């Protein structure tokens, strides 16, 4: 079970996303963030890994975004430090739980995103 | 005496009067393919004096602030006459090399260059994407490339450079530059010698190989001691690199491969 | 068809498989040749002679 | 069936065993070898190659090309040392990252003599003399030329032949030394001093460089394989 | 094998000057202690037997950790592309040299554990390790037809047994394994577009030695069991052909690239001991 | 390049077979087997239809198939039906550990 927090609007200022999941998937699996402008297609935004307190940001948003975790209540957060008019998009929270058969490096399992949240629209306009 | 030397290979002659004693790499002179080691069945062309001759590469400028230079073989001879034409007309090619580096200065100059011959001289990239350096930058021709003092990531995602970033103390490959002396080498120390001579056999895991895809030897020149001179403004001295391919043989004649550029 | 070799007193080895990759590594062939890396010079140097440069 | 008794150590896996094993690709046609130049049969062939020492290692100079250059100058004569070293070739940080020290960090015990080879990279008009010294341990480490001249030393004259070699002899209480910086098997002290000074004429640079090299002799050996501390892999 | 004995030496006063040399030549000055100090006679009994390349490489190194599950339909089979390059120690030891040629002794150490409490217990599992040569079909499911292994080699391992062992010969298509490859797989030709002719630097063959496919042969128990197969790689009959300096900064990828840990040496003063 | 290239729209009659290509480069499709496909309808979260190359999740019908040809990949829908109308997205893994989606392909049924 994956929950997405509300829908928002403001120009310019910072916006904080919230995604809460079940305790097992919070303990074991990484959370991926995906955005989609209307009709324009999916854009990957980054990964947060509460199993090992690690995060990766995409190169388009590496200066702007920051991911955190809330270990006592199985919740992850996604904060965009500034907003632009191109950021008017539907945003997705996704959990990677379909394992690849191919061993990643030689020590790890690779997971595809197969559980997707209800999502959050954010619009950036005056 | 051992300081005076003459090298003659196919209507090219190099004379020197302040040589150190020349290096035959790994004790092995260049040789043709023996019949017990031949993989291809077709008759090789052996161009002899039309290809086995000294070609003079473009001169690089040594400065006090300069970091070092590198070249790839046979890539640096890809435009040099009938050797380059035979390389681009044939699928498989094999050559040893005689490498002559020339750097003359006065008795009042000081400085030392280490000239290193590296088999399979891989160089590190410029980005977080592994193994991403393109053909047009890894095969630069006779202009070669330069080492750099520090590593610098290419931040451009739209138009990535796909270049090398060879750090000089890391020898472009993540190994210590002081430990590069296990490669075949000479030192041009300006108080004693003005030239370095390395004779390189064909070293590969195959008896013959695709020269347009693969480079057997790299030549790296690093300033072990920087160039200095008493004039308060600046100084520059030229470095010239003269290479003769040796025991050339080529297999698999077909139409000319014109590789992509810039 | 056994192979008897001295340990430095003897030990016995029998190869049980037809493939040569199946064999154990031998305690043998300790030979060396350092001259090709340490003295790879065209004209042979003598260590007491003046190595001019 | 033959009556058999299973000894202890049955069904173990020792990572240094020398047993036979079945082949997964039987009757395979192996590609024949060719005479590639440069075949190494012992790792001590690589320790015998002279390899440049990161001697300088100060805060403005470490992890640059300036770590290998020791700066001499034509200043007036003083008995203070130019460079100092400990004979701990796997655990002195000047000597650990040489090719000798990198081979040595895969081993626990070492023995044999060492060659320290120094190259003068000044002008031809610059000449000087130097004292390269080796002090066997058990005393205060030599801080002046007057102390270091009682030890094993070579006087180098900087003439036409630009390089000098100081053979550090094998002087030890034990047959092998521990490589892990233990005081029971410490190797002693190596230092370099001006004897007279480097004399430089006019219109000649006054600062000069000396590069140092290290290599092993033919009496050198190592005997207990181990993993290095130089490499690591994070999660 | 024996080292040369130290010969006795008196004091010297001669034109013979072994101390002076020329590192510009690229020759190491081949001195002994007899050339620079007075020496006594010492019969030398040390040997270089433990420093041979066979002795240097006769150890088993962990190369892969292959996770596999026994579960109610999450990772019921796993495939690992065979390379040594993802573990740093055997990679550094091999990357002392440019070319090599060895037979290889694979060893598989299997461990397994329960992952939940309530749902009962499990019987002893059987593990299949199928070698897939490059071009043989990769399984899509754990019960695919590819596991019939009519021509693929296949080790069946019972849990609780000693670790399974496999020898493979020198399988390389060249006369030596190329640790380093200064080149490309394709040459881009003039008139090709930017989508054609590109290839990775240093890559050579993109699937050089194939892959190992691991499954649990048993049907699912009501409790999920997770198993890890550790693959241990020991070279034997080793020959090596062109020595290189060892790697000084942390590894980054299959190539020679670096990004982090570029300051390996510590700070120590010039005249401190 | 950044984003992986896809054709913008593909049209097909019922009962025919269509192929939707996805061309990347040497560092995502040409190096890794981690190539996947997604299916999206209007307002819906995307559904995974192919996860490894040639491999289907449970519940996805057998008329979806895919393959690799080196530096490019394809998704095949055989015997097209009206419920297959929608947007299809390619997915792959780049060797700098970023993930990349394709440009999408609106498939419409004639
Ligand atoms: C059931 C086990 C089967 C195992 C099959 C092993 C396939 C051959 C692996 C050879 C590895 C060679 C490593 C050197 C490669 C190089 O650096 O060129």
PDB file of C-alpha atoms and ligand atoms in Angstrom, chain D residues 24-25, chain E residues 80 82-85 94-95 97-104 106-108 129-134 153-155 165-172 176-180 204 208-212 231 233, ligand 1:
ATOM      1  CA  UNK D  24      32.961 -28.707 -16.898  1.00  0.00           C
ATOM      2  CA  UNK D  25      34.203 -28.306 -20.487  1.00  0.00           C
TER       3      UNK D  25
ATOM      4  CA  UNK E  80      25.303 -13.585 -13.168  1.00  0.00           C
ATOM      5  CA  UNK E  82      30.991 -13.979 -15.346  1.00  0.00           C
ATOM      6  CA  UNK E  83      33.647 -11.364 -14.559  1.00  0.00           C
ATOM      7  CA  UNK E  84      36.303 -10.829 -11.901  1.00  0.00           C
ATOM      8  CA  UNK E  85      36.093  -7.045 -12.162  1.00  0.00           C
ATOM      9  CA  UNK E  94      45.452  -9.745 -11.932  1.00  0.00           C
ATOM     10  CA  UNK E  95      45.916  -6.096 -12.975  1.00  0.00           C
ATOM     11  CA  UNK E  97      49.996  -7.719 -15.416  1.00  0.00           C
ATOM     12  CA  UNK E  98      48.639  -6.962 -18.875  1.00  0.00           C
ATOM     13  CA  UNK E  99      48.241 -10.455 -20.330  1.00  0.00           C
ATOM     14  CA  UNK E 100      47.578 -13.753 -18.624  1.00  0.00           C
ATOM     15  CA  UNK E 101      46.676 -17.348 -19.362  1.00  0.00           C
ATOM     16  CA  UNK E 102      45.459 -19.729 -16.678  1.00  0.00           C
ATOM     17  CA  UNK E 103      43.210 -22.626 -15.950  1.00  0.00           C
ATOM     18  CA  UNK E 104      40.521 -21.772 -13.450  1.00  0.00           C
ATOM     19  CA  UNK E 106      35.541 -22.409  -9.559  1.00  0.00           C
ATOM     20  CA  UNK E 107      34.197 -23.158  -6.066  1.00  0.00           C
ATOM     21  CA  UNK E 108      30.628 -22.501  -4.887  1.00  0.00           C
ATOM     22  CA  UNK E 129      24.259 -23.940 -11.255  1.00  0.00           C
ATOM     23  CA  UNK E 130      23.947 -23.980 -15.035  1.00  0.00           C
ATOM     24  CA  UNK E 131      26.716 -22.494 -17.146  1.00  0.00           C
ATOM     25  CA  UNK E 132      25.334 -20.550 -20.097  1.00  0.00           C
ATOM     26  CA  UNK E 133      27.954 -20.156 -22.836  1.00  0.00           C
ATOM     27  CA  UNK E 134      27.580 -16.919 -24.834  1.00  0.00           C
ATOM     28  CA  UNK E 153      27.279 -27.824 -18.108  1.00  0.00           C
ATOM     29  CA  UNK E 154      25.327 -27.999 -14.873  1.00  0.00           C
ATOM     30  CA  UNK E 155      26.337 -28.624 -11.263  1.00  0.00           C
ATOM     31  CA  UNK E 165      34.191 -27.548  -7.432  1.00  0.00           C
ATOM     32  CA  UNK E 166      34.685 -27.094 -11.172  1.00  0.00           C
ATOM     33  CA  UNK E 167      37.792 -26.776 -13.304  1.00  0.00           C
ATOM     34  CA  UNK E 168      37.591 -24.910 -16.588  1.00  0.00           C
ATOM     35  CA  UNK E 169      40.518 -24.712 -19.056  1.00  0.00           C
ATOM     36  CA  UNK E 170      41.915 -21.630 -20.764  1.00  0.00           C
ATOM     37  CA  UNK E 171      38.784 -20.648 -22.709  1.00  0.00           C
ATOM     38  CA  UNK E 172      40.046 -17.455 -24.348  1.00  0.00           C
ATOM     39  CA  UNK E 176      46.206 -14.690 -23.672  1.00  0.00           C
ATOM     40  CA  UNK E 177      43.521 -13.076 -21.553  1.00  0.00           C
ATOM     41  CA  UNK E 178      43.682  -9.322 -22.116  1.00  0.00           C
ATOM     42  CA  UNK E 179      43.293  -7.561 -18.780  1.00  0.00           C
ATOM     43  CA  UNK E 180      43.633  -4.194 -20.517  1.00  0.00           C
ATOM     44  CA  UNK E 204      36.235  -5.820 -26.383  1.00  0.00           C
ATOM     45  CA  UNK E 208      33.145 -12.621 -23.119  1.00  0.00           C
ATOM     46  CA  UNK E 209      32.668 -15.786 -21.060  1.00  0.00           C
ATOM     47  CA  UNK E 210      28.929 -16.207 -20.638  1.00  0.00           C
ATOM     48  CA  UNK E 211      26.954 -16.503 -17.441  1.00  0.00           C
ATOM     49  CA  UNK E 212      25.973 -18.753 -14.546  1.00  0.00           C
ATOM     50  CA  UNK E 231      31.508 -18.003  -6.147  1.00  0.00           C
ATOM     51  CA  UNK E 233      37.762 -18.131  -8.165  1.00  0.00           C
TER      52      UNK E 233
HETATM   53  C1  LIG G   1      29.793 -24.477 -13.729  1.00  0.00           C
HETATM   54  C2  LIG G   1      30.883 -23.397 -13.745  1.00  0.00           C
HETATM   55  C3  LIG G   1      31.275 -22.945 -15.159  1.00  0.00           C
HETATM   56  C4  LIG G   1      32.245 -21.758 -15.174  1.00  0.00           C
HETATM   57  C5  LIG G   1      32.616 -21.262 -16.580  1.00  0.00           C
HETATM   58  C6  LIG G   1      33.721 -20.202 -16.557  1.00  0.00           C
HETATM   59  C7  LIG G   1      33.888 -19.403 -17.845  1.00  0.00           C
HETATM   60  C8  LIG G   1      35.328 -18.925 -18.067  1.00  0.00           C
HETATM   61  C9  LIG G   1      35.792 -17.784 -17.150  1.00  0.00           C
HETATM   62  C10 LIG G   1      37.230 -17.318 -17.447  1.00  0.00           C
HETATM   63  C11 LIG G   1      37.647 -16.017 -16.733  1.00  0.00           C
HETATM   64  C12 LIG G   1      38.933 -15.379 -17.306  1.00  0.00           C
HETATM   65  C13 LIG G   1      39.423 -14.118 -16.562  1.00  0.00           C
HETATM   66  C14 LIG G   1      40.411 -13.249 -17.377  1.00  0.00           C
HETATM   67  C15 LIG G   1      39.731 -12.329 -18.400  1.00  0.00           C
HETATM   68  C16 LIG G   1      40.583 -11.144 -18.984  1.00  0.00           C
HETATM   69  O1  LIG G   1      41.018 -10.339 -18.121  1.00  0.00           O
HETATM   70  O2  LIG G   1      40.728 -11.112 -20.239  1.00  0.00           O
END
